[PDB]
Paper text:
The mammalian glutathione peroxidase (GPx) family is a key component of the cellular antioxidative defence system. Among the three different isoforms present in nature, the 170-residue, 19.5 kDa monomeric cytosolic isoform is essential.
We successfully cloned, expressed and purified a fragment from Met1 to Leu170 of the cytoplasmic isoform of mouse GPx4 with selenocysteine 46 mutated to cysteine. GPx4 crystallized spontaneously in a 1.5 ml reaction tube at 2 mg ml−1 concentration at room temperature after acquiring the NMR spectrum. The first six N-terminal residues, Met1, Gly (added for the purposes of cloning) as well as Cys2–Arg5, are not visible owing to disorder. Overall, the mouse GPx4 has the same fold as its human homologue. The active site of the GPx4 enzyme consists of the catalytic tetrad Sec46, Gln81, Trp136 and Asn137. All of the cysteine residues are in the reduced form.
Author numbering: 6 to 170
The structure:
Amino acid sequence: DDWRCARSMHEFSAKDIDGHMVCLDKYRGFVCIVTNVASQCGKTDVNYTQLVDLHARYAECGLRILAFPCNQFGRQEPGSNQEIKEFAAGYNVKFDMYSKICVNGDDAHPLWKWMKVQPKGRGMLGNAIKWNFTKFLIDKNGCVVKRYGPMEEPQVIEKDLPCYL
């Protein structure tokens, strides 16, 4: 449980939604949105729609999106990885979908433990993830540069991208 001493997202690995383990150093050079998703949330439609749009408009400019399904917020992600994959398909998702994880507590994925402690990943009312669709913006070196809350629609991140692209 060495995660705290990591200096970059690129030191971490996670299982993609098809179960392949992926080393996140593949995102070196790319700016990344890392977000916790859910299918049965009141924010699901606006977030999937705008994330997909952003990725369509900025992938060639070096934007990548990592989506981590999580069922800790109102039980709004109850389905299997297979089902979640098909649900993301329904929104024409072409960014990267990961296997369902926890983001809070002792069994949280270590990337998520790490993000939450970074200087620009610190929360309001403590560091915990508060609800579905929190977003962290990660620079080309894998450092956290910003955190946006559940109610900050992905389009608000667009004005921040030229600082990093």
